[PDB]
Design an enzyme around this catalytic site. Structure first.
Site, PDB file in Angstrom:
ATOM      1  N   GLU A  36       0.785  -1.224   0.000  1.00  0.00           N
ATOM      2  CA  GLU A  36       0.000   0.000   0.000  1.00  0.00           C
ATOM      3  C   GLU A  36       0.820   1.278   0.000  1.00  0.00           C
ATOM      4  O   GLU A  36       0.325   2.319  -0.394  1.00  0.00           O
ATOM      5  CB  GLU A  36      -0.891   0.014   1.255  1.00  0.00           C
ATOM      6  CG  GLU A  36      -1.912  -1.115   1.212  1.00  0.00           C
ATOM      7  CD  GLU A  36      -3.014  -1.015   0.199  1.00  0.00           C
ATOM      8  OE1 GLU A  36      -3.808  -1.893   0.020  1.00  0.00           O
ATOM      9  OE2 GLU A  36      -3.086   0.116  -0.429  1.00  0.00           O
ATOM     10  N   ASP A  83      -6.351   6.599  -4.996  1.00  0.00           N
ATOM     11  CA  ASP A  83      -5.867   5.257  -5.103  1.00  0.00           C
ATOM     12  C   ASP A  83      -5.843   4.815  -6.572  1.00  0.00           C
ATOM     13  O   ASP A  83      -6.132   5.588  -7.482  1.00  0.00           O
ATOM     14  CB  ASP A  83      -6.544   4.295  -4.132  1.00  0.00           C
ATOM     15  CG  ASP A  83      -7.949   3.838  -4.514  1.00  0.00           C
ATOM     16  OD1 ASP A  83      -8.636   3.058  -3.857  1.00  0.00           O
ATOM     17  OD2 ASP A  83      -8.360   4.320  -5.631  1.00  0.00           O
TER      18      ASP A  83
END
Length: 164
Positions: free
Chosen positions: A11, A20
């Site tokens: 991540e 994202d």
């Protein structure tokens, strides 16, 4: 290696609101804020989540706190899910981490949808499950990360990450 280090690798860590891979507002170690297009809606969710006026920015400590909550919630979710629990219980420690990673990225519901792959993992048919997991939007959209998770299920070792 452990679940935290694994997820930190996949991540990343960002202290300012960002979008994202799917274009959604996120912050920290993959903490989704909202699927809404408004940066304003995002800044609002952020302040609600942290308990302060952040103005779109958080500290390392705040990032890690959200991360601890998210990992805990992913685990508790698997344990409460009728489809996921049996798979989790059947797996070894390393493979358990791979299922937690999927749940963290895509949600309980999303993973619970991988019916056939779940069945194969439960049966311990490693190679077959790896091939089936790759036939998904997940794999096509984030292939490097999916491959790492897939290798983990396939081998039951941390090789995919001992590189990284």
């Amino acid at each position: 290696m452990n679940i935290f280090e694994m997820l930190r690798i996949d991540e990343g860590l960002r202290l300012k609101i960002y979008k994202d891979t799917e274009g959604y507002y996120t912050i920290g170690i993959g903490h989704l804020l909202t699927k809404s297009p408004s940066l304003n809606a995002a800044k609002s969710e952020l302040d609600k989540a942290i308990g302060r006026n952040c103005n779109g920015v958080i500290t390392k400590d705040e990032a890690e706190k959200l991360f601890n909550q998210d990992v805990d919630a992913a685990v508790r979710g698997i344990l409460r899910n009728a489809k996921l629990k049996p798979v989790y219980d059947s797996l070894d420690a390393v493979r358990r981490c791979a299922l937690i990673n999927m749940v963290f990225q895509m949600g309980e519901t999303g993973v619970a949808g991988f019916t056939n792959s779940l069945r194969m993992l439960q049966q311990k048919r490693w190679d077959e499950a790896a091939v089936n997991l790759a036939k998904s939007r997940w794999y096509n959209q984030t292939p490097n990360r999916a491959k790492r998770v897939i290798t983990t299920f396939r081998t039951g070792t941390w090789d995919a990450y001992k590189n990284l």
